[PDB]
Amino acid sequence: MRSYRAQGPLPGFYHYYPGVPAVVGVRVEERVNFCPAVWNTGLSADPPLFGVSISPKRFTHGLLLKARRFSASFHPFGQKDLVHWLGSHSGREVDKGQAPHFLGHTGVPILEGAYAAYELELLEVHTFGDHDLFVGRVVAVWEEEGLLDEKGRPKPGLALLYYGKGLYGRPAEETFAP
Amino acid sequence: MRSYRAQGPLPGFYHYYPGVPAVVGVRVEERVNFCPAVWNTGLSADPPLFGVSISPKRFTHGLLLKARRFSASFHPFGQKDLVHWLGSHSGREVDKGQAPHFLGHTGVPILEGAYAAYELELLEVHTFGDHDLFVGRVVAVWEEEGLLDEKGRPKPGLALLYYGKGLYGRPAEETFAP
Ligand SMILES: Cc1cc2nc3c(=O)[nH]c(=O)nc-3n(C[C@H](O)[C@H](O)[C@H](O)COP(=O)(O)O)c2cc1C
Ligand SMILES: Cc1cc2nc3c(=O)[nH]c(=O)nc-3n(C[C@H](O)[C@H](O)[C@H](O)COP(=O)(O)O)c2cc1C
Numbered sequence: 001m002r003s004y005r006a007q008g009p010l011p012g013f014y015h016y017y018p019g020v021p022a023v024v025g026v027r028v029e030e031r032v033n034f035c036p037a038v039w040n041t042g043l044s045a046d047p048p049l050f051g052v053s054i055s056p057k058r059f060t061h062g063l064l065l066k067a068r069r070f071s072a073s074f075h076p077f078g079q080k081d082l083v084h085w086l087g088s089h090s091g092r093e094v095d096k097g098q099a100p101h102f103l104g105h106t107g108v109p110i111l112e113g114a115y116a117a118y119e120l121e122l123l124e125v126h127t128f129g130d131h132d133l134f135v136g137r138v139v140a141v142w143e144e145e146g147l148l149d150e151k152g153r154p155k156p157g158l159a160l161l162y163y164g165k166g167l168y169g170r171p172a173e174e175t176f177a178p
Numbered sequence: 179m180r181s182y183r184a185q186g187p188l189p190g191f192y193h194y195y196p197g198v199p200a201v202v203g204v205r206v207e208e209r210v211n212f213c214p215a216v217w218n219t220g221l222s223a224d225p226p227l228f229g230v231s232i233s234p235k236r237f238t239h240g241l242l243l244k245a246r247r248f249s250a251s252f253h254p255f256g257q258k259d260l261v262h263w264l265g266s267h268s269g270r271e272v273d274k275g276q277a278p279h280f281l282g283h284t285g286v287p288i289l290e291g292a293y294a295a296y297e298l299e300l301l302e303v304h305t306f307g308d309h310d311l312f313v314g315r316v317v318a319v320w321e322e323e324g325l326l327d328e329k330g331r332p333k334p335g336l337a338l339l340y341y342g343k344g345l346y347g348r349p350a351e352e353t354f355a356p
Binding site: 005131144 | 179182193226304307308315331332342346351
């Protein structure tokens with residue numbers, strides 16, 4: 001097993017991939033934007049808190065700070081092209097609001113085709129190096145009827161997985177319950 | 179598409195799964211513990227920062243606060259049984275240090291068999307509801323040659339995935355690069 005001491009950013013920072021990209025939806029007045037975020041994680045069960053790490057370089061960063069409300073939606077493999085397209089262009093150069101979406105209960109935009117989505121109120125924002133963590137409280141839930149299993153778990157093979165640097169995949173259908 | 183307002187903890191909080199479980203290794207004096215953490219994410223590229231969200235109920239939590247150093251290791255689907263075991267029992271009841279492991283450059287314990295691992299210096303801890311986010315700086319990197327690709331991602335299909343509530347999988351073999 002090879003090793004090295006870190007001396008700055010890693011030659012690839014992909015060791016913990018793949019991950020499910022969360023699609024971050026945000027609205028400020030008429031303007032809707034979407035941004036995939038693979039740097040995402042649950043943060044608390046009670047209360048339900050979910051976080052997304054967003055670079056201050058993203059158009060989405062300013063919109064979140066203004067809106068203080070956002071969606072995180074989770075999309076099937078079949079939407080790989082759309083998710084990659086949302087993550088390869090900025091709202092500085094393209095109205096990604098033209099992407100098919102709807103407004104949730106709190107008025108946050110939610111990208112269409114998702115098997116699940118959270119509406120979130122922004123609770124806190126924390127800077128860690130070159131990204132800011134946006135901590136949202138889940139205030140509403142959208143779920144596709146039957147793309148989730150008995151305990152609320154997305155069905156094997158369905159989820160879009162991101163491997164980093166524009167490489168995508170999906171879970172295998174085989175599961176293990178040891 | 180079904181929806182509801184959040185009224186406390188969610189019936190299932192698995193909408194964003196599967197994820198790669200990071201195995202969190204920690205050492206205090208002669209005592210070594212491990213803890214899988216599916217709530218994990220990259221937090222910064224420059225500098226390289228990585229977070230794990232750990233409940234104050236975990237034996238690991240106090241050890242992390244004392245040691246200020248830990249590992250995060252990433253394991254192949256073959257080690258599904260070991261990873262599940264480590265997150266099914268507490269260091270309060272069983273010496274998990276007995277799991278085969280080595281010490282890293284900075285003396286953190288790294289569980290054997292990982293395709294990759296970080297040695298981390300603890301930078302910050304933040305409370306978000308019922309879990310604490312431990313923000314580590316990657317100070318060293320371990321890689322299993324030939325299990326990672328050209329850019330550093332684990333080879334297609336190798337990663338252990340966790341679906342929540344004791345269910346596991348792996349990524350599909352096929353990858354797609356739009
Ligand atoms: C699959 C995928 C995952 C991504 N994950 C993140 C992320 O976690 N945080 C982030 O700041 N950018 C991430 N990006 C980059 C942004 O999505 C990308 O810069 C996007 O064009 C930003 O659009 P915006 O400027 O309209 O906000 C990701 C991109 C892709 C394709
Ligand atoms: C796959 C898996 C992922 C887990 N993810 C987390 C996590 O992100 N944060 C956490 O606090 N516990 C998590 N747990 C629970 C701990 O791993 C479990 O409570 C473990 O027994 C803690 O051991 P400890 O008391 O020695 O720290 C997870 C468990 C499993 C099996």
